[PDB]
Amino acid sequence: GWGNLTCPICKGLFTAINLGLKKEPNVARVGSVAIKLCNLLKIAPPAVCQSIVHLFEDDMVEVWRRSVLSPSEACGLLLGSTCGHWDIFSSWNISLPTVPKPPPKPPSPPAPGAPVSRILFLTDLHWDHDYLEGTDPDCADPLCCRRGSGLPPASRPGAGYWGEYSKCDLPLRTLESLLSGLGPAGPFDMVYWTGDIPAHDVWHQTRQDQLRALTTVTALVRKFLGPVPVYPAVGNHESTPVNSFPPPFIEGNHSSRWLYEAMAKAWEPWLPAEALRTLRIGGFYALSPYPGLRLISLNMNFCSRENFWLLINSTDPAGQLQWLVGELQAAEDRGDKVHIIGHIPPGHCLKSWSWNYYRIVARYENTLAAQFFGHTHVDEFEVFYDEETLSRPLAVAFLAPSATTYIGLNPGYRVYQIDGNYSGSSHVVLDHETYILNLTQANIPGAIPHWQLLYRARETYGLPNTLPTAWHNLVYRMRGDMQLFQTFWFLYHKGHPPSEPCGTPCRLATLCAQLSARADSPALCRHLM
Amino acid sequence: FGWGNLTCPICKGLFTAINLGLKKEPNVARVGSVAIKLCNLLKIAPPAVCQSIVHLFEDDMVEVWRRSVLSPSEACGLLLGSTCGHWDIFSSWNISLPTVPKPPPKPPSPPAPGAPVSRILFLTDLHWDHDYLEGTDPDCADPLCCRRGSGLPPASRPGAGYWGEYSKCDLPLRTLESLLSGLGPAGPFDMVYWTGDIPAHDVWHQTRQDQLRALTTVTALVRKFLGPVPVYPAVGNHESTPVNSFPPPFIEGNHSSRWLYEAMAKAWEPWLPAEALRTLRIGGFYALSPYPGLRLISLNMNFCSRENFWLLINSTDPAGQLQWLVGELQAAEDRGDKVHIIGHIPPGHCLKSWSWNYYRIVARYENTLAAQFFGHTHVDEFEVFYDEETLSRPLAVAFLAPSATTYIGLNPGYRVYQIDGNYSGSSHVVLDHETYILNLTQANIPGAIPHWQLLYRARETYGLPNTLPTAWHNLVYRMRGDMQLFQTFWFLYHKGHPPSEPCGTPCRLATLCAQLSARADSPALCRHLM
Ligand SMILES: *[C@@H]1O[C@H](CO)[C@@H](O[C@@H]2O[C@H](CO)[C@@H](O[C@H]3O[C@H](CO)[C@@H](O)[C@H](O)[C@@H]3O)[C@H](O)[C@H]2NC(C)=O)[C@H](O)[C@H]1NC(C)=O
Ligand SMILES: *[C@@H]1O[C@H](CO)[C@@H](O[C@@H]2O[C@H](CO)[C@@H](O[C@H]3O[C@H](CO)[C@@H](O)[C@H](O)[C@@H]3O)[C@H](O)[C@H]2NC(C)=O)[C@H](O)[C@H]1NC(C)=O
Ligand SMILES: *[C@@H]1O[C@H](CO)[C@@H](O)[C@H](O[C@@H]2O[C@H](CO)[C@@H](O)[C@H](O)[C@H]2NC(C)=O)[C@H]1NC(C)=O
Ligand SMILES: *[C@@H]1O[C@H](CO)[C@@H](O[C@@H]2O[C@H](CO)[C@@H](O)[C@H](O)[C@H]2NC(C)=O)[C@H](O)[C@H]1NC(C)=O
Ligand SMILES: *[C@@H]1O[C@H](CO)[C@@H](O[C@@H]2O[C@H](CO)[C@@H](O)[C@H](O)[C@H]2NC(C)=O)[C@H](O)[C@H]1NC(C)=O
Ligand SMILES: *[C@@H]1O[C@H](CO)[C@@H](O[C@@H]2O[C@H](CO)[C@@H](O)[C@H](O)[C@H]2NC(C)=O)[C@H](O)[C@H]1NC(C)=O
Ligand SMILES: *[C@@H]1O[C@H](CO)[C@@H](O[C@@H]2O[C@H](CO)[C@@H](O)[C@H](O)[C@H]2NC(C)=O)[C@H](O)[C@H]1NC(C)=O
Ligand SMILES: *[C@@H]1O[C@H](CO)[C@@H](O)[C@H](O)[C@H]1NC(C)=O
Ligand SMILES: *[C@@H]1O[C@H](CO)[C@@H](O)[C@H](O)[C@H]1NC(C)=O
Ligand SMILES: *[C@@H]1O[C@H](CO)[C@@H](O)[C@H](O)[C@H]1NC(C)=O
Ligand SMILES: *[C@@H]1O[C@H](CO)[C@@H](O)[C@H](O)[C@H]1NC(C)=O
Ligand SMILES: *[C@@H]1O[C@H](CO)[C@@H](O)[C@H](O)[C@H]1NC(C)=O
Ligand SMILES: [Zn+2]
Ligand SMILES: [Zn+2]
Ligand SMILES: [Zn+2]
Ligand SMILES: [Zn+2]
């Protein structure tokens, strides 16, 4: 009978497809057809389509050939079981160590006169380098206010001197202003630097340009902050194409070796030997700023939904989660405490990665003191609960607003007051402050650039402390009180909220976001009606 | 604005490049060879068979996959869906019956005493090997044995019988000569319905020339022995090569089926009138009027078939034939005549939507449709149709006739139906039927003379007041109750040569459930068997 032939004909078919598109000419064909389709969907002008697709085609086809179309996979998709196996984005688990979990003990308020560690948090600087004042703020292009955007017609003004309120990342001068005005204050013990150094022009980006951004902005930070250590993390716009972060099992040229070795060449002064070693492989590391404290810098792109290399293998990329566990357990032993920093927050991640992270923080509550994440470009947080009943806040991650202005925001940075350096310190965020540059004032001719204080957390929300329970109570408190949420919304946008009023469903969506540290998991929002 | 928007265009371009890539013959060769190695890996069957069969399928197979499954997209509509591409493969469809209101139901009236009767001979699944060779190995490693190249049986196993064999072998032409020669007793026939499957079961090395050989020589044989009596054939699943390949009319030659359809109507020109030949050259189905007041429809069930891969491209009412059928059936309702439907594969072995639309049609046209005949099963059984609303009322039954061929351990056999005869007011419904078989245990003895015996008669054997559908329904549930009776139906099921295994309760249930399922993917139909 013929029924037996379907499977072999399928496997052979995708073998011929596989080896067939491994040749460049067909890759060119896919590129051009994709260009015509891009032109059909419009958004954006044709040259952008051309450049972007020419940039993506190679690695895109590479991964699809090695993942989606690899027979099989594909035959396991169309037939399944008997023929092939489709594992794409399959579930996986990281297997915590067998050490029994110590009983949860919440941290105690710091003793009077105890030391305090001030930490500067910079994220999403997004340096354009093509920013040109006077250009068109609203143009047809993924990014405007830069060389090649043209001029605004008639009554619409050009881009501001310090940056603009539409699209338009920052010119280097505004980063210089940010770093010069750091005095008051200040002084900082350390700086957490999340990533996203390059601008949002993703179609024509080049490795040389990305390296330019990384090295020059690193040099700027280093110039202004001097001896204070800066601990960076890898953002989602560092590599090119944007979001392309092949795990360590991909080897050059097309691997990430270039970016990871450009880093750790630039960050050599800040990071110790081991940190650099692990950074050269996967782009993540661990170190000890204080005795009794451990900082973990995670590469969240192996977390990312938009990182297509995960189609190939999405299972604990670079084995980093496991590594993290080894560290966190290493921290439980020794009686130390851990700070985690990263670009993309957990709960923006795929499915399994997020759940494994949640499982880890829940297991490691007493050890993990704080967590910091960027990427959102807006000011918000995320609350973690116990994995069983999800009724008890065990930790919170702080999502800091972007230094960049991207999509209509005032620039800003954050500063954390944290339990300081000494034995027994909890190393937990005591408070935080948010500075912004009001562009309406700063762009006036003759104005004096000023980085104002905006708000202080505890002062604004009346929190007895910054521990998770307080943020939980703040969320449910805002569900009820609309004025309070209006405050949180004003600060959410760094003082430049949009024109749309953000009515009731908007509020509900936002608060639900504040409560979801685990991707999917709709139940986390159950108590919000 | 980010890469996430590009996935769709990159996909569509990807599968365009794949499409044009495997549109070249060298790549087709590569897929063929990989498939050959895989076949050898799964074993079953010997390597030469794998090689030949895949070499026969590869061309058209790649054609269809390129044009359907992999056509971007489709494929992209599968991996992304909705917003990007549309995946319709084996999607639902409906035939839209005409708006004429259904006439009020009513049972056919019993024929008056002394009324005329039309005897019809039903031949199906002749499966002529032409390579059948007595003495060769009946059980060999091969899809088909008892032929040239099967070798000799080792040691104690005897060879193949002169008149055919009881394991995995088709018929030699001489046994078809025997069948057609012994047709006298009895009786005289008014017409002959011939379902299909003329060529043998060797599907790996088949060639168009061979299939046409079978068609023309066997057609010539039937015409020789039955002479002036009309034979209305149908297209079986073994005609075209590769087996089951029946591209709809929207596929054009060379690789289309026009060669087979025009080879027919060249061979069947004496039997079928002009229109029949015209539509048969297109779709392989036709309509004609054997009697005044009666209409015979011959459907090509390959557009029905699950095993026909050309439907991957478009599975929706191939050749628009179902619609055509409606147009004919309605034409009869206004005209007040009755319809006989014949085809190879029975409805309920068909895909999903085709089957359900067929059920809907027969249900709508019940009073008009007098009888239905189908082959393919190679075994003696039937299928009962119910009302589309409550599914409690049998509105019709289709008769699945046993095979003339011996394929898979059966005595050869043919059937003859007694039908309400030619006259005004005739119901044209099956009154009874008979089944003749050639017992090979006796016929293959040296010096024996092949004899085609009577086996059973329906009404007498099952004690049915008539052959109308209600009778067969009552028979099925009676068999659910009575195990001895089912044992009878099982003996006749195999044409008098039931297997060694006792069958029994789960077997019985499966068989009866099959008898009640005329619509594929209709498990509810068997609910009442518990
Ligand atoms: C239309 O399509 C047909 C199927 O693709 C194709 O039939 C093929 O014809 C060739 C040449 O006659 C045969 O060639 C093979 O077999 C013959 C006879 O055994 C040998 O002489 C050859 O060396 C070779 O082995 C194929 O067997 C035959 N395929 C089948 C299965 O029918 C027609 O030729 C096509 N016609 C046109 C217009 O190209
Ligand atoms: C096809 O031909 C077969 C051989 O003629 C025949 O099988 C034979 O059937 C008879 C009985 O019909 C068996 O003889 C039996 O007779 C006594 C009578 O008292 C029984 O008690 C015994 O069971 C005894 O078996 C033969 O033994 C048997 N021979 C073989 C080879 O099986 C089939 O019945 C015929 N089948 C059809 C469908 O006609
Ligand atoms: C290595 O990395 C990628 C291939 O994955 C490729 O882009 C490099 O070649 C350069 O890439 C530039 C874009 O980033 C492109 O604009 C430039 O023309 C091209 N050529 C060079 C030498 O810069 C690959 N280069 C290597 C090391 O072969
Ligand atoms: C954290 O505090 C400890 C003291 O509690 C500091 O360690 C001292 O460092 C000085 C040199 O600057 C040595 O002379 C002392 O002997 C050290 N004492 C101990 C107990 O280690 C440490 O410098 C502080 N860490 C940071 C980063 O400021
Ligand atoms: C940023 O600057 C603008 C202008 O200086 C502030 O908006 C002003 O708010 C006052 C409140 O009474 C109004 O009377 C003015 O008309 C506003 N000016 C304009 C042109 O909008 C704005 O509040 C500042 N943002 C913050 C809070 O830092
Ligand atoms: C599949 O085939 C049919 C033609 O048989 C295509 O369009 C149908 O054609 C019939 C007859 O002309 C019309 O009466 C129907 O209305 C049509 N149906 C639909 C759903 O459009 C149909 O487009 C083909 N589908 C594919 C996959 O191309
Ligand atoms: C069906 O019966 C009809 C009569 O109802 C038969 O037709 C007659 O055939 C004879 C012999 O040729 C003619 O003399 C008559 O003129 C015919 N009458 C009509 C009205 O057709 C016919 O023989 C039967 N048909 C078949 C196929 O048996
Ligand atoms: C087809 O596949 C099944 C296993 O899925 C195998 O057991 C069987 O032998 C194959 N069919 C034939 C006719 O060999
Ligand atoms: C993905 O990585 C994990 C961890 O090594 C391992 O199962 C294997 O390398 C990959 N799984 C696959 C290829 O399915
Ligand atoms: C593994 O993680 C998944 C999420 O990816 C979670 O739903 C599941 O409970 C875990 N599975 C096992 C077998 O522990
Ligand atoms: C593609 O781009 C446009 C404009 O950036 C956006 O509105 C749209 O949502 C994108 N496509 C999808 C499917 O989201
Ligand atoms: C008729 O088509 C509709 C969808 O338009 C579908 O829901 C229904 O099941 C179809 N009817 C049949 C008998 O398939
Ligand atoms: Zn960013
Ligand atoms: Zn980012
Ligand atoms: Zn058959
Ligand atoms: Zn058949």
From Swiss-Prot, chain A:
Keyword RNA-binding among record annotations: no
Result for mutant: R392W: In NPDB; some patients have a NPDA/NPDB intermediate phenotype
Compartments where located: Lysosome; Lipid droplet; Secreted
Phenotype when changing N93G: Reduces protein levels. Reduces sphingomyelin phosphodiesterase activity. No effect on secretion
Glycan-bearing residues: N4, N93, N253, N313, N421, N438
Positions bearing the site annotation: Cleavage: D169, L170
Effect seen on changing M300I: In NPDA and NPDB
Effect of P393L: In NPDA and NPDB
Phenotype when changing R294H: In NPDB; reduces enzyme activity; some patients have a NPDA/NPDB intermediate phenotype
Name of the protein: Sphingomyelin phosphodiesterase
Organism: Homo sapiens
Residues shown, of full length: 85 to 613 of 631
